[PDB]
Amino acid sequence: SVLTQSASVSGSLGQSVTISCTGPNSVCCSHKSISWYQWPPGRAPTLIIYEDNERAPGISPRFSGYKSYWSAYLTISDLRPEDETTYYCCSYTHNSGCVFGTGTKVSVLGQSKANPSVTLFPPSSEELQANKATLVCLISDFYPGAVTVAWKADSSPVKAGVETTTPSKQSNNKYAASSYLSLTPEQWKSHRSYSCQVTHEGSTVEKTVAPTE
Amino acid sequence: EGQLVQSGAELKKPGASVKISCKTSGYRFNFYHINWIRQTAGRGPEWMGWISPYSGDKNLAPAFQDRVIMTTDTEVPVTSFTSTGAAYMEIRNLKFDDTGTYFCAKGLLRDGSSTWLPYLWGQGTLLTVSSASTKGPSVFPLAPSSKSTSGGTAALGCLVKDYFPEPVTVSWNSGALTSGVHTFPAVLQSSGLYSLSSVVTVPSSSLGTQTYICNVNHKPSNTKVDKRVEPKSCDKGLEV
Amino acid sequence: VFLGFLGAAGSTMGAASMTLTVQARNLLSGNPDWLPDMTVWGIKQLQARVLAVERYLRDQQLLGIWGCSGKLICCTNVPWNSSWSNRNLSEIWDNMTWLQWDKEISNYTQIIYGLLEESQNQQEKNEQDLLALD
Amino acid sequence: VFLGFLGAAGSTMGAASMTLTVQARNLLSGNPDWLPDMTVWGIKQLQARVLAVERYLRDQQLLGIWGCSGKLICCTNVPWNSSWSNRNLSEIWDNMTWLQWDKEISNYTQIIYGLLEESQNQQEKNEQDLLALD
Ligand SMILES: *[C@@H]1O[C@H](CO)[C@@H](O[C@@H]2O[C@H](CO)[C@@H](O[C@@H]3O[C@H](CO[C@H]4O[C@H](CO)[C@@H](O)[C@H](O)[C@@H]4O)[C@@H](O)[C@H](O[C@H]4O[C@H](CO)[C@@H](O)[C@H](O)[C@@H]4O)[C@@H]3O)[C@H](O)[C@H]2NC(C)=O)[C@H](O)[C@H]1NC(C)=O
Ligand SMILES: *[C@@H]1O[C@H](CO)[C@@H](O)[C@H](O)[C@H]1NC(C)=O
Ligand SMILES: *[C@@H]1O[C@H](CO)[C@@H](O)[C@H](O)[C@H]1NC(C)=O
Ligand SMILES: *[C@@H]1O[C@H](CO)[C@@H](O)[C@H](O)[C@H]1NC(C)=O
Ligand SMILES: *[C@@H]1O[C@H](CO)[C@@H](O)[C@H](O)[C@H]1NC(C)=O
Ligand SMILES: *[C@@H]1O[C@H](CO)[C@@H](O)[C@H](O)[C@H]1NC(C)=O
Known part of the structure; x- marks a missing residue:
């Protein structure tokens, strides 16, 4: 994509924010029409701005657009928690197709932070019949998009079988993730307690189970 | 009130071909262009091409000029304002770069400078090119x-x-x-x-x-x- | 493009506005020649083409009592109300037919005639009389 | 104030001028629907509502041949004659009805139509033709 936008953009609560969109000499972002797309990753996107500063029907007037002689601009007044997602710009003509840009992640801060919900699960009896063992560490309802998970067998670090997901946005404007630990029945029987530690940026939630209990 | 439905999930091999449907409802199928755009993690989203069920005029990307073939049936009018058409798309010469979620959507307006612009999108269809x-x-x-x-x-x-x-x-x-x-x-x-x-x-x-x-x-x-x-x-x- | 009588019934309102004279010229003169003198069958079609001109003259009276009077396109001074079809420009004239338009307006269409007959000439004429003496 | 159809028949001419559309809209469309086909009784009422539109079109021809043409209030260029109703302003519009007005004018009303049809468009049009070339 020669259509270059802003790298990564943050913002504050109830303020404005600006996203850029420009590119190549052929793609001079001038005699061409510009549109903007709100793209929730993995869900239904939305057209908000089409062909110029004119916005789509139903869009609140908090959004606005501008077109200079070499680039296009997106302005957002009164930032809301549901606006915390990635946007994209497209340049096109009446006959040519769409040309997406590089992308611009948006993070609106100044909101009420969320204390996380971390839950630990052992393998059940049916998995003990399967001769495997999987610790399940589920994370939800935390505001900043950064978590670090550590697995400790008898309070001793584990490196093999450690898998941790990526932060995923909860539909309630929070975040969610998970992490698993695969172990063998020999390593399941030869330990006392298992620990999943999730180090938050302002706290740390640790959950401890045991095969004997 | 156009509630469009795409095809189901299918698995194919590289070098083979796959055909994806795009069934429509609730709106006049011949009144709007039908866009087709993919989303691959290797190159981001890429507009594949649009087609006109009325005039029979298609327009693809020069990169998809050889491997993409888009067809449309004739609309089945349910009421005076509702029809149930269908838009199929066959893709051949499957490679590793053609793995992702594909979309078909309804054209914007029936006249003006932005007529074919995708407004109502389908739910999507994920394809994984794997041997x-x-x-x-x-x-x-x-x-x-x-x-x-x-x-x-x-x-x-x-x-x-x-x-x-x-x-x-x-x-x-x-x-x-x-x-x-x-x-x-x-x-x-x-x-x-x-x-x-x-x-x-x-x-x-x-x-x-x-x-x-x-x-x-x-x-x-x-x-x-x-x-x-x-x-x-x-x-x-x-x-x- | 012409496409003859009613050719743009399913086209946009903007494209349909290009053929106003076409729909206007074929509604008033569907002239049947009734030179043969046949008793009971003439009264029915005569009543028909008399009620036709009665309806035509009702429409002409409605188009005369307003500030508009030319049998053409015309602008007024009554503002459009946001409650009536909450839509922007180009959304109406490029993705809508006159049928669906009148259908959506039919809920609020009855007061628009009153706003055009009273809020205009019942005050525009009076302002014309009190501003033409100087 | 409205007071409906003919409500200001005994009020002043100024107050009666506030209800011109009211008296205008109810004279042309007293529409009877003659869908039933009844022999000798339809011709009488049909002649009635045809002579109605004939009289209406006679009035419209009289209001078109004059410089006035809008079916509303309108001003001319024919001066009022002091011989016709030797009265001042506000004496007419605030203590007189249109009935008594037409009664007093009926003695001199017949020449006013001629002064409006000949002293105006038989010369105003000709002046318009000989003053529109520059
Ligand atoms: C019945 O309903 C159908 C479907 O709704 C209508 O079909 C649509 O018709 C409109 C125009 O009436 C189409 O809009 C146009 O698309 C044209 C495509 O363009 C060219 O290039 C290809 C090659 O790729 C040629 O094959 C093709 O013939 C064209 O030459 C555009 O060129 C049009 O643009 C015009 O308007 C813009 C306004 O901004 C001008 O700037 C341009 O210069 C140009 O004049 C226009 O965008 C639409 O694509 C059709 N299909 C749809 C909507 O799916 C029928 O018209 C309609 N029929 C009736 C009688 O109502
Ligand atoms: C025409 O298209 C626009 C945008 O696609 C849509 O908002 C509008 O409702 C459409 N018109 C009708 C009558 O549905
Ligand atoms: C629009 O209509 C509503 C109700 O019919 C009325 O209350 C309002 O004043 C109107 N506004 C305008 C601008 O006409
Ligand atoms: C345009 O549309 C927006 C959103 O639907 C609405 O708030 C605004 O009042 C509309 N403006 C006009 C002039 O119709
Ligand atoms: C008024 O009328 C009389 C007779 O009808 C006529 O002699 C006189 O010239 C007229 N005056 C004006 C100003 O019209
Ligand atoms: C109205 O009153 C004035 C003064 O009282 C009088 O001169 C005039 O004749 C009256 N109008 C009529 C029609 O009698």
């Missing part, structure tokens, strides 16, 4: 877990593990349970395996009045697994 084999999943139950000891909330679910082809949808009690249903994304193993889980937050008092059965429906493998989660807990924070 591997279709392997069914392994579905396990999950032991209930305490979520709030003072509140009394349990968390029970099902575990879909080790399936190579397209992902799987899961219902609860034949779709009779939607409150608390929270589904986790899949994994990527070193061998190329995908595996996820699902869970629901149930009342701790709901152990002798309701029954919770998860229903896994793997369509590319054409399998179904109906599991019953045992109400006997094992978390020390949940027995109370």
Whole structure:
């Protein structure tokens, strides 16, 4: 994509924010029409701005657009928690197709932070019949998009079988993730307690189970 | 009120071909262009091409001029303002770069400078170009877990593990349970395996009045697994 | 493009506005020649083409009592109300037919005639009389 | 104030001028629907509502041949004659009805139509033709 936008953009609560969109000499972002797309990753996107500063029907007037002689601009007044997602710009003509840009992640801060919900699960009896063992560490309802998970067998670090997901946005404007630990029945029987530690940026939630209990 | 539906998930090999449908409803099929745009993680989204069911005029990207063929049927008018058409798309010469979610959408306006612009999008259709084999999943139950000891909330679910082809949808009690249903994304193993889980937050008092059965429906493998989660807990924070 | 009588019934309102004279010229003169003198069958079609001109003259009276009077396109001074079809420009004239338009307006269409007959000439004429003496 | 159809028949001419559309809209469309086909009784009422539109079109021809043409209030260029109703302003519009007005004018009303049809468009049009070339 020669259509270059802003790298990564943050913002504050109830303020404005600006996203850029420009590119190549052929793609001079001038005699061409510009549109903007709100793209929730993995869900239904939305057209908000089409062909110029004119916005789509139903869009609140908090959004606005501008077109200079070499680039296009997106302005957002009164930032809301549901606006915390990635946007994209497209340049096109009446006959040519769409040309997406590089992308611009948006993070609106100044909101009420969320204390996380971390839950630990052992393998059940049916998995003990399967001769495997999987610790399940589920994370939800935390505001900043950064978590670090550590697995400790008898309070001793584990490196093999450690898998941790990526932060995923909860539909309630929070975040969610998970992490698993695969172990063998020999390593399941030869330990006392298992620990999943999730180090938050302002706290740390640790959950401890045991095969004997 | 146009409620469009695309095709189902399918698995193919590189160098082969696959055909994706795009069934429409609730609007005049011949009044709007039909766009087709993909989303691949290797090059981001790329506009593939649009077509006109009325005038029979298509327009592809020069990169898709040889391998993409888009066809449309004639609309089936239901009322004076509603028709049920169909738009198919066949793609050949499958490579590793053509793996992702594909979309078809309705044109914007019937006249003006932006007529074909995609407004109403379909739900999408994920394709994975792989030489591997279709392997069914392994579905396990999950032991209930305490979520709030003072509140009394349990968390029970099902575990879909080790399936190579397209992902799987899961219902609860034949779709009779939607409150608390929270589904986790899949994994990527070193061998190329995908595996996820699902869970629901149930009342701790709901152990002798309701029954919770998860229903896994793997369509590319054409399998179904109906599991019953045992109400006997094992978390020390949940027995109370 | 012409496409003859009613050719733009399913086209946009903007494209349909290009053929006003076409729909106007074929509604008033569907002239049947009734030179043969046949008793009971003439009164029915005569009543028909008399009620036709009665309806035509009702429409002409409605188009005369307003500030508009030319049997053409015309602008007024009554503002459009946002409650009536909450839509922007180019959304109406480029993705809508006159049929669906009148259908959506039919809920609020009855008061627009009153706003055009009273809020205009019942005050525009009076302002014309009290501003033409200087 | 409206007071409906003919409500200001005994009010002043100024107050009666506030209800011109009211008296205008109810004279042309007293529409009877003659869908039933009844022999000798339809011709009488049909002749009635045809002579109605004939009289209406006679009035419209009289209001078109004059410089006035809008079916509303209108001003001319024919001066009022002091011989016709030797009265001042506000004496007419605030203590007189249109009935008594037409009664007093009926003695001199017949020449006013001629002064409006000949002293105006038989010369105003000709002046318009000989003053529109520059
Ligand atoms: C019945 O309903 C159908 C479907 O709604 C209508 O079909 C649409 O018709 C409109 C125009 O009436 C189409 O809009 C136009 O698309 C043209 C495509 O362009 C060119 O290039 C290709 C090659 O790729 C040629 O094959 C083709 O013939 C064209 O030459 C555009 O060129 C048009 O643009 C015009 O308007 C803009 C206004 O901004 C000007 O700037 C341009 O210079 C140009 O004049 C226009 O965008 C639309 O694509 C059709 N299909 C749809 C909507 O799906 C029928 O018209 C309609 N018929 C009736 C009688 O109502
Ligand atoms: C025409 O298209 C626009 C945008 O696609 C849509 O908002 C509008 O409702 C459409 N018109 C009708 C009559 O549906
Ligand atoms: C629009 O209509 C509503 C109700 O019919 C009325 O209350 C309002 O004043 C109107 N506004 C305008 C600008 O005409
Ligand atoms: C345009 O549309 C927006 C959103 O639908 C609406 O708020 C605004 O009042 C509209 N403006 C006009 C002039 O119709
Ligand atoms: C008024 O009328 C009389 C007779 O009808 C005529 O002699 C006289 O010239 C007229 N005056 C004006 C100003 O019209
Ligand atoms: C109205 O009153 C004035 C003065 O009282 C009088 O001169 C005039 O004749 C009256 N109008 C009529 C029609 O009698």
